[PDB]
Amino acid sequence: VRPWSEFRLTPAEAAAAAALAARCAQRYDETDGPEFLLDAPVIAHELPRRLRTFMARARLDAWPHALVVRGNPVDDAALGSTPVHWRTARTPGSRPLSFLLMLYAGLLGDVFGWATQQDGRVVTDVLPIKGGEHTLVSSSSRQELGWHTEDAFSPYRADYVGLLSLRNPDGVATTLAGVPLDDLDERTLDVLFQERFLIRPDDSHLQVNNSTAQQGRVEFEGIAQAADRPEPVAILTGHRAAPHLRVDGDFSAPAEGDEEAAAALGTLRKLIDASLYELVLDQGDVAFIDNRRAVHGRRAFQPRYDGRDRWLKRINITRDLHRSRKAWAGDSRVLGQR
Amino acid sequence: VRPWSEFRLTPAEAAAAAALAARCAQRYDETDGPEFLLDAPVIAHELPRRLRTFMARARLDAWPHALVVRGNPVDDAALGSTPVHWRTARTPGSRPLSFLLMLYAGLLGDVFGWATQQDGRVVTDVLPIKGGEHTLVSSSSRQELGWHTEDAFSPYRADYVGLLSLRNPDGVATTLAGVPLDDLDERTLDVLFQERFLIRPDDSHLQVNNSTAQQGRVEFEGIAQAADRPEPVAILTGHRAAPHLRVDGDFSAPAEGDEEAAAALGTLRKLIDASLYELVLDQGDVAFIDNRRAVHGRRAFQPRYDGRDRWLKRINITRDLHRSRKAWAGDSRVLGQR
Ligand SMILES: N=C(N)NCC[C@H](O)[C@H](N)C(=O)O
Ligand SMILES: N=C(N)NCC[C@H](O)[C@H](N)C(=O)O
Ligand SMILES: [Fe+2]
Ligand SMILES: [Fe+2]
């Protein structure tokens, strides 16, 4: 079997999808502009019907950890070299594919960004940055990006995480793991369902990993409060036979002086490590990871820094934007609190 | 101003929408069948673009209590007489309009029903039943249907409640009320945000208001547990400047021996009563009430029982079906627990 739901575009379907994305890139100024954010869900209705059928059905299935779409053509010559930093990563060559990702994302829910991550951008970049190979963020390389729920600290975290591979010549794998329900005993399961765990915000929300001012953007103050004074939360929620998962390998901890909770988390680490599997996003592959069913990461790899490094576009998706209205910065689609 | 977001179909747009609904009625056996439940969201993409644009945008606005669509043609001759009971309310005349409601609903989210209400039907009926004029359910008439959040007792309650008026010759009004935030003092507001209120399941989930067996459908046992042993919950949730509302006028109460909570609920009753406004759903009008922003009801009216009584089709909608996977009866779209 495959733990994800997979769809392969025919050449005609992919060509049509790309043509629609090119139309949007031609007509709109940017993906994150208020105009295209509103229209993308409606424009996405013009995508190939077999893809729309897959996205509507696969989303409502109970089992898959991700929805994978293969076969989007990407011309390395037209794309150009991989950017050295995310700041300067909105290149004309990558523009149509950013619009394509937002169109696909529009079929699954409401796209949003974070005020404290990559300058409040909705469409974000994942690429290796020179100097930061051994960091705990997505711009790492030599150090493996440990498994985690995206923005695990926040209750306004995405339901789905979209990942479109612009290039990945050496086939570096995205890691994935579901809830290890076949190995979790009921006592450990009970404890994971209780609010006895501290999940702090990851390093992508730090001020150093955003541009120069930016800080002091008031939304960083809420990140500091989440890091300094994290309130206890549960790792598992909902149905015991198919729980939703909320955990971060490098930023989770038990409640202070709670050894029962600690033992449960320690056991969960072991079981997730042992059941971790690989998903290689080849050039043109799009993956929408179910952020509630699965944790994800990225394998360690040797960065090139020759202009052809692994490069993904990424986007956060929620099924309901009004869930996070407390975290609304303003009228924009950028979340964060004081 | 109007507290809801309104859209009027042009004759051509309405005709096209009706034609699409007729196509679905011709091709599918029923609305609640597993086939059309999966396909309706995709088929809804073929609706008029101006309507799809309205539904995508109006859903993401912060202010409206409901999304109202006017101007769907309904032929009283083709429709036929109003049913005497919901059991026998799936008439051939009302069939195309039931498909139309599910197509509109498909643009807003995932439709579902309740195992303990109207025999697990997704598309339900609202009509006056002889003998039950002074009941606390939607089939009442002479007694006003008091304001409430739909299925307030359940955490799996709908995000939107769809209401399509098949006929309403005497213009009986649907009542609506938002959070009375202009009158709620901060102390009362604080208490409403705390888990100090008991919300029991309404009478539509009782065994007497469903068909003969049915009982003992195991899902009624969870309703009994919710009625007998309700666990404390908050009336208001989320953002203090725009809270989500969870209350039932006839089935809410404070926590036992909690007079502070009682006073807050008592005050809330007064403010909702004083700010209650009317929305008349004329023949062909569709209303998608925001179940989190507003409570709703129906004004008292004298029932006719002459074959032309007020008659609505109704449907529950959630932004995410996986939110209620604990309450999944099976593979079907019908909720309820043991
Ligand atoms: N959660 C950990 N361990 N690292 C952060 C990875 C996340 O994907 C983060 N949004 C990032 O892009 O760095
Ligand atoms: N909540 C009160 N007061 N009555 C029940 C009305 C609800 O709309 C219920 N689902 C019904 O149809 O009777
Ligand atoms: Fe991530
Ligand atoms: Fe109701």
Q: How many whole angstroms does the radius of gyration of chain A measure? A: 19 Å
Structure summary, number of beta strands of chain A: 16
Globally, the shape of chain A reads globular
- Overall number of domains of chain A: 1
**Chemical compounds bound to the protein:** (2S,3S)-3-hydroxyarginine, fe (ii) ion
| CATH homologous superfamily descriptor of chain A | Clavaminate synthase-like
Going by helix content, strand content and strand pairing, the class of chain A is alpha+beta
The CATH topology of chain A is what? Double-stranded beta-helix
SSE string of chain A, helix = H, strand = E? EHHHEHHEEEEEHEHEEEHEEEEE
Greatest interface (CB-CB under 8 A), with counts per chain? A-B, 27 and 27 residues
Biggest beta sheet attributes of chain A? 8 strands, mixed
What is the subunit organization of this protein? homodimer
Number of contiguous helices of chain A: 8
CATH class of chain A reads Alpha Beta
Helical content of chain A, roughly?
Answer: 25-40%
Q: What separation lies between the terminal Cα atoms of chain A?
A: 45 Å
- Measured by DSSP, the beta-strand proportion of chain A falls in 15-25%
